[PDB]
Amino acid sequence: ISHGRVFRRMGLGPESRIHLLRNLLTGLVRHERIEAPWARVDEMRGYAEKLIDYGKLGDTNERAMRMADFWLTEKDLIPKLFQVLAPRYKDQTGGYTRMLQIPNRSLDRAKMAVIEYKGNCLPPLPLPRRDSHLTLLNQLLQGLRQDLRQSQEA
Amino acid sequence: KSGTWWDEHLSEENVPFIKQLVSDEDKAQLASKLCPLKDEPWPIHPWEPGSFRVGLIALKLGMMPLWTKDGQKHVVTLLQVQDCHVLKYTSKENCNGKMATLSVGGKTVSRFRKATSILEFYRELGLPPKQTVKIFNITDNAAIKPGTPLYAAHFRPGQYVDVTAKTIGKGFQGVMKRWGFKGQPATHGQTKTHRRPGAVATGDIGRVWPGTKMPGKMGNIYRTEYGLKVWRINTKHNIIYVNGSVPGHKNCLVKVKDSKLPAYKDLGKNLPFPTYFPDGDEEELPEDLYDENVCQPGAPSITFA
Amino acid sequence: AAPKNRRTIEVNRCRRRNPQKLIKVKNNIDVCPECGHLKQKHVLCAYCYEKVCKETAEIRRQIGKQEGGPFKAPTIETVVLYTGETPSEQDQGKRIIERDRKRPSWFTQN
Amino acid sequence: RFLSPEFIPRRGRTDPLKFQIERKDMLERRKVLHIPEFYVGSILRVTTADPYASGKISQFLGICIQRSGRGLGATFILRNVIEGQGVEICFELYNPRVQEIQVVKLEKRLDDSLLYLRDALPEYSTFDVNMKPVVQEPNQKVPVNELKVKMKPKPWSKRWERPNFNIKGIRFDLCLTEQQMKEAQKWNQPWLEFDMMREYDTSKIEAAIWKEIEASKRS
Amino acid sequence: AIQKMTRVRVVDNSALGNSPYHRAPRCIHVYKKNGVGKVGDQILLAIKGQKKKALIVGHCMPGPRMTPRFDSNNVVLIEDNGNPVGTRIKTPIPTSLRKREGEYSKVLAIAQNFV
RNA sequence: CUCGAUGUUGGAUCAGGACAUCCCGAUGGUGCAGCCGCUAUUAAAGGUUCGUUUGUUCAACGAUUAAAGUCCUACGUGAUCUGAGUUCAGACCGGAGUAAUCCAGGUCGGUUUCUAUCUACUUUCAAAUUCCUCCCUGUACGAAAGGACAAGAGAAAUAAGGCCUACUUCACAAAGCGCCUUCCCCCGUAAAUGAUAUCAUCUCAACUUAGUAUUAUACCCACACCCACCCAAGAACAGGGUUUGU
RNA sequence: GCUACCUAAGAACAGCUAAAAGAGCACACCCGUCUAUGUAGCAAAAUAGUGGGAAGAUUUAUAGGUAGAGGCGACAAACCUA
Ligand SMILES: [K+]
Ligand SMILES: [K+]
Ligand SMILES: [K+]
Ligand SMILES: [K+]
Ligand SMILES: [K+]
Ligand SMILES: [K+]
Ligand SMILES: [K+]
Ligand SMILES: [Mg+2]
Ligand SMILES: [Mg+2]
Ligand SMILES: [Mg+2]
Ligand SMILES: [Mg+2]
Ligand SMILES: [Mg+2]
Ligand SMILES: [Mg+2]
Ligand SMILES: [Mg+2]
Ligand SMILES: [Mg+2]
Ligand SMILES: [Mg+2]
Ligand SMILES: [Mg+2]
Ligand SMILES: [Mg+2]
Ligand SMILES: [Mg+2]
Ligand SMILES: [Mg+2]
Ligand SMILES: [Mg+2]
Ligand SMILES: [Mg+2]
Ligand SMILES: [Mg+2]
Ligand SMILES: [Mg+2]
Ligand SMILES: [Mg+2]
Ligand SMILES: [Mg+2]
Ligand SMILES: [Mg+2]
Ligand SMILES: [Mg+2]
Ligand SMILES: [Mg+2]
Ligand SMILES: [Mg+2]
Ligand SMILES: [Mg+2]
Ligand SMILES: [Mg+2]
Ligand SMILES: [Mg+2]
Ligand SMILES: [Mg+2]
Ligand SMILES: [Mg+2]
Ligand SMILES: [Mg+2]
Ligand SMILES: [Mg+2]
Ligand SMILES: [Mg+2]
Ligand SMILES: [Mg+2]
Ligand SMILES: [Mg+2]
Ligand SMILES: [Mg+2]
Ligand SMILES: [Mg+2]
Ligand SMILES: [Mg+2]
Ligand SMILES: [Mg+2]
Ligand SMILES: [Mg+2]
Ligand SMILES: [Mg+2]
Ligand SMILES: [Mg+2]
Ligand SMILES: [Mg+2]
Ligand SMILES: [Mg+2]
Ligand SMILES: [Mg+2]
Ligand SMILES: [Mg+2]
Ligand SMILES: [Mg+2]
Ligand SMILES: [Mg+2]
Ligand SMILES: [Zn+2]
């Protein structure tokens, strides 16, 4: 009866789950774009969002430094978190990462996803774009929208 | 041939516009039904013995404790009425049963996730679609025009009601949890047999009798709690305080009806009939209606003297 | 337990060829507008994603050459430049990665 | 600004309207019976109406060892030793039978729960039932009593040395050997405190509650 | 709270309940249909090799709110007619026992402290 | 019938059924005053305790209970479990035998396999049983002792179905030790009126009453958005939500 | 070349107590008490835990000896290539 369970069961246990996400999170910070199974990326995505929040607390905060020390197994990424990633999202209150589904892995046909930090220097992902406003359906709705605004003013 | 959804082909600009457009229409439709008595209401007959009125559909918010004037503690379940309207009325001849039926819906949901036949049913009625529809058996004199809103003041404190809802589904469960079997001991030699059913039948029959308790799906079925007393009525938020617990999880839609137990028969003399009309009420009801034995929050502390 | 009797092919065909065991035809397949290859509606295009990954791999190799070893992550932002391009005003003070090719059309400079 | 622990709802899928209406009933009760600020470890005297007691009024003095529950059902446990017998009563904050809640001594302890006082010496649970209240100076920090109790010989009611309890007010050196301390560390979970997704941030929740509390006082 | 094989502590000043013995007083039967004893329920004790009825006046198991909870399982020795064996009860007992003054009038008459 | 195998005690688990009824219901008789009993008719919906010794079925005993029913089901059920007993190979004691060895004599120890092909089954009913207290009442009854029934009130236990406000194991929730709800009838006889047989007669005479329910009612009830995401829904599938599709 | 026993010549046995030890606690090592799992298994006798011994009638490497009307046996009718 998994009613209200929000944490997945992965790895060899609870501690192994954290270490698996930590390695993915450490890889995500260094490369700013990684690919992994969809479930693990979705599980890791929540931690990536909160890691930036600790970066906004500043390197002078002992609690933030301790949290960054644990989750970044490579200590060269700790200066990057507080001096590159955190200043990057100074004007953003959320949505630090985007997660998209890529075709299944060739070996085990596993559901794969790609997660990246927004604003990276890497070439952009082929983001899905909505239909253009000049399509037949959108033109009809635009005409309907104009009619309502004109009637409202009158 | 490929499937589609409402906002598949919408542009970036249109999606906020469409959401605002349909949302405003739903609020306008709900606000248009606020005066049922000024839109040619059906005749209102006085209550008679043996007459059955309609119930409501309420959402289970949660549970809250209350104390009575004798010091006893009673825990009650909060049932909030959310967008409850009468949908369809079927005559006694056409009901194929012994009584006329009145269809009631609640908890307005999105039009984009409903069937075309359902959407056009609500288009004629002029209301946004309801998540759950329940059928209430009523007498002829209790008929209510479709589209009439229903409020939690339909019930009054001191009344006993029945609540029906789908119970919490526990999935596939063994006999120990589903049927409360004793199971087998944990030690003294037991070999891979601790929660197993054991014997399922006798050797002579050579078959398992139909209706034998076996592991399977547990819960997620409709159950009814009878004789739930109504302690408090909140007219502002349309909340019914029913005694004890009701089947189902929180935020689920329940079916509230007057109790069918013989001890509570013909107790609707002082209850509104066929329902409660706030627009036609001479004096506006107070925010909260309390039972005679309920300690109100503003009341002084209990003193035995 | 062991089977009491051999199951016939007529019985086996009904189980094996049941519609529950048959492959379901997918209806969420569409042509990618950028390249013309097929893709699913909720899945990124395989051809385009490989194109981005090929360019990403080249950029990451150039990053390692400048870093020249492990634990060499810079404390400044990174900008990728191609042939015939010069750093802009907003790109001053950032690590510069140079690629010996013309900038791809789909890789818009920011 | 002290917000009572019951006003802050636990994490869950309950509709916020249920909490808002439940808070309204709590506020209307607080203007009839004054509920003073107290923490776990404070000495409280509670006067309640008992239909069978002499004078129909009962008074119990003890140390608040646990505060738990939310909404109208919030409860606190008072522990005291009377005639050599340990007695605990779990009072309800919003029960109308409660006549008065008096804070004899407002203080905090090193732990959020003092359930281990059951396994401690009787001197740490014995308080005078007629002790005069201690005056608390206004606009002063609530005193923190860093007293560490001495435990009775094992076995205890619970394995208080385990890391999950996180107890700091017990003299483990006097009662436990180094080997037992090392054995208890086998259940330590270093990753638990660094699990970011398990954090419950109620700063925005508490901000909205205070607006509701301030609005009620005006009317 | 108190069931079969449960050791109890006698809180009255009776000689039987306070005389030293190599076996602690133990509950052998609870006069309830469910077999679980609470405050105010009579049980049978095998104390000093003898069978004596007792009245439960406190237990460690949590009960309803606003009711005391004791750190020991306390009983008072009573006769078959309900008259207590002892003469003074120094240990405090719950005030909820006063709803049974029709049958426990003499038991409450020797109780010095109510909690 | 089965030895090209139909696996034995007792226990655990789950119980199906019979009524020749232990308890609860309705009646007749009494050497039935009352309170308790005895006996017979009717009734199988519901229930039928926890322990010490013994491998035990039993039995004895302790404490209870409205009662601790009698039997069938391959002495129900080991492809669910147990292996104490029993029943291999070791050994001991008594006894039989020249010995090997034997003894419904005792005694200690002693491998319990099977991945389910087929049949059957996997949410039947959503009406509840019982005890105790108060009251009636120290009344009916009776020389006294003793001591009801019916009606009414209240509080519990068990069973069934749910739930998490608090307590508790716990902590986005699942749970009980916690809380909430739980509704009809039972046919044996006892009486009128009145024929065969002009009284009488409760009638496999016509008929009337206690005396009966089409078991009442309740529950369920509309349907391609559906690629995808979420879920108090779930093994998969299905189902709910997305007006919560960067 | 397994095992039973024997022959020639080798090897191993931490720490603590007692310091005398077919002595105690306890690794390596030897054995296989009890329970669970396993039962076409990892294994034609194992795994995990718990246990007996562990300076001795100990354990063990190498070569040799005793052969079926037999060997060998601190007798279990043991063991002598499942
Ligand atoms: K045979
Ligand atoms: K029966
Ligand atoms: K025995
Ligand atoms: K068959
Ligand atoms: K006759
Ligand atoms: K092996
Ligand atoms: K040889
Ligand atoms: Mg889940
Ligand atoms: Mg796994
Ligand atoms: Mg479920
Ligand atoms: Mg068990
Ligand atoms: Mg065994
Ligand atoms: Mg086995
Ligand atoms: Mg097992
Ligand atoms: Mg057969
Ligand atoms: Mg304990
Ligand atoms: Mg004796
Ligand atoms: Mg055969
Ligand atoms: Mg049996
Ligand atoms: Mg049965
Ligand atoms: Mg009979
Ligand atoms: Mg019969
Ligand atoms: Mg009955
Ligand atoms: Mg008679
Ligand atoms: Mg048998
Ligand atoms: Mg069988
Ligand atoms: Mg058997
Ligand atoms: Mg045996
Ligand atoms: Mg002999
Ligand atoms: Mg013989
Ligand atoms: Mg043995
Ligand atoms: Mg034997
Ligand atoms: Mg076997
Ligand atoms: Mg078996
Ligand atoms: Mg099986
Ligand atoms: Mg099925
Ligand atoms: Mg009576
Ligand atoms: Mg239950
Ligand atoms: Mg006549
Ligand atoms: Mg005549
Ligand atoms: Mg006559
Ligand atoms: Mg006559
Ligand atoms: Mg679909
Ligand atoms: Mg030699
Ligand atoms: Mg040594
Ligand atoms: Mg030795
Ligand atoms: Mg070896
Ligand atoms: Mg040996
Ligand atoms: Mg030794
Ligand atoms: Mg030879
Ligand atoms: Mg030997
Ligand atoms: Mg021999
Ligand atoms: Mg032999
Ligand atoms: Zn493409």
Side-chain angles (χ1 to χ4, degrees), chain D residues 106-125:
Chain D
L106 172 62
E107 64 175 353
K108 301 175 59 180
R109 301 291 287 266
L110 297 177
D111 300 315
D112 202 6
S113 179
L114 299 186
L115 296 180
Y116 57 84
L117 297 185
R118 307 166 179 174
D119 300 319
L121 298 181
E123 57 182 7
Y124 300 101
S125 303

Side-chain angles (χ1 to χ4, degrees), chain B:
Chain B
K1 294 179 299 181
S2 60
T4 181
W5 49 107
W6 70 276
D7 63 322
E8 175 183 6
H9 310 288
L10 304 191
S11 60
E12 289 284 354
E13 302 88 0
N14 287 331
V15 175
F17 165 71
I18 297 300
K19 289 187 178 181
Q20 186 72 210
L21 179 66
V22 296
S23 178
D24 291 352
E25 182 183 17
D26 294 356
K27 300 180 180 180
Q29 292 178 4
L30 294 175
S32 63
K33 305 291 184 179
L34 294 181
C35 298
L37 298 183
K38 295 181 179 180
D39 295 329
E40 299 177 355
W42 288 7
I44 299 181
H45 303 93
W47 178 89
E48 299 179 2
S51 299
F52 299 98
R53 61 172 185 172
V54 73
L56 312 183
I57 290 186
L59 182 137
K60 176 184 180 179
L61 284 181
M63 306 184 67
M64 175 188 307
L66 55 75
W67 296 262
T68 55
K69 292 186 178 181
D70 55 355
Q72 300 298 327
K73 171 184 177 298
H74 298 74
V75 54
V76 299
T77 302
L78 276 69
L79 300 176
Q80 182 188 3
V81 175
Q82 304 178 182
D83 299 330
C84 192
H85 294 71
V86 177
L87 302 186
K88 187 176 61 178
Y89 166 80
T90 306
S91 59
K92 182 179 179 181
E93 303 172 350
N94 306 325
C95 280
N96 198 18
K98 301 183 180 180
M99 285 177 298
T101 58
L102 204 57
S103 296
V104 178
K107 194 178 179 303
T108 278
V109 288
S110 168
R111 295 199 286 264
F112 301 139
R113 313 299 178 175
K114 282 293 174 294
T116 300
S117 56
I118 294 184
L119 287 179
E120 65 187 5
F121 166 74
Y122 284 99
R123 180 178 58 183
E124 299 179 351
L125 189 55
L127 289 170
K130 308 296 182 182
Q131 172 178 332
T132 296
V133 179
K134 293 306 179 185
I135 295 179
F136 293 87
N137 300 331
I138 64 174
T139 54
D140 287 333
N141 61 329
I144 304 180
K145 181 184 179 183
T148 302
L150 296 177
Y151 304 95
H154 179 91
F155 303 102
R156 296 300 169 91
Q159 182 189 358
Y160 295 87
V161 301
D162 303 340
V163 181
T164 302
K166 265 184 172 179
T167 63
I168 298 177
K170 301 171 185 180
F172 201 104
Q173 296 295 336
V175 296
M176 291 204 60
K177 173 171 291 184
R178 194 185 182 189
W179 306 111
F181 284 4
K182 300 179 183 181
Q184 287 74 9
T187 55
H188 292 286
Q190 310 300 328
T191 298
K192 301 190 301 182
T193 302
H194 301 284
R195 309 179 61 90
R196 307 185 68 176
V200 297
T202 60
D204 186 12
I205 49 184
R207 63 181 182 94
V208 180
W209 277 93
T212 301
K213 299 177 181 177
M214 283 188 170
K217 300 291 193 300
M218 183 180 183
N220 197 22
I221 59 174
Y222 284 96
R223 288 297 182 180
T224 301
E225 291 290 329
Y226 300 92
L228 299 185
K229 186 177 182 178
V230 175
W231 296 95
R232 183 180 175 183
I233 295 297
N234 192 334
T235 60
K236 180 181 179 181
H237 296 87
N238 296 121
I239 295 196
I240 308 170
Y241 293 72
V242 292
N243 180 82
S245 60
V246 302
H249 57 90
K250 57 177 57 62
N251 300 333
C252 82
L253 294 182
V254 309
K255 182 183 188 184
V256 192
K257 190 180 177 181
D258 303 10
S259 187
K260 76 130 187 179
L261 296 188
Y264 311 134
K265 179 186 174 185
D266 298 325
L267 288 189
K269 179 180 180 181
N270 303 275
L271 299 174
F273 194 89
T275 180
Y276 174 78
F277 296 95
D279 56 332
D281 195 1
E282 301 177 2
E283 183 180 1
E284 185 179 2
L285 288 180
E287 183 172 353
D288 304 324
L289 297 174
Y290 297 93
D291 193 72
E292 298 181 0
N293 300 326
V294 168
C295 290
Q296 306 177 8
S301 298
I302 295 182
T303 56
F304 303 94

Side-chain angles (χ1 to χ4, degrees), chain D residues 191-202:
Chain D
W191 71 93
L192 191 62
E193 64 171 341
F194 299 105
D195 202 328
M196 295 177 292
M197 290 297 295
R198 298 180 68 92
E199 297 173 351
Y200 189 20
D201 178 66
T202 62

Side-chain angles (χ1 to χ4, degrees), chain E residues 66-85:
Chain E
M66 317 292 295
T67 63
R69 191 193 74 88
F70 299 84
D71 294 335
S72 62
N73 302 278
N74 303 332
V75 300
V76 180
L77 295 184
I78 61 179
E79 302 288 345
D80 194 7
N81 49 29
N83 305 338
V85 181

Side-chain angles (χ1 to χ4, degrees), chain D residues 10-13 18 66 68-70 73 75 77 90 158 197:
Chain D
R10 287 184 170 272
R11 186 159 51 186
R13 306 177 69 179
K18 187 261 179 180
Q66 173 184 348
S68 56
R70 303 296 186 266
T75 56
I77 307 179
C90 187
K158 294 178 178 177
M197 290 297 295

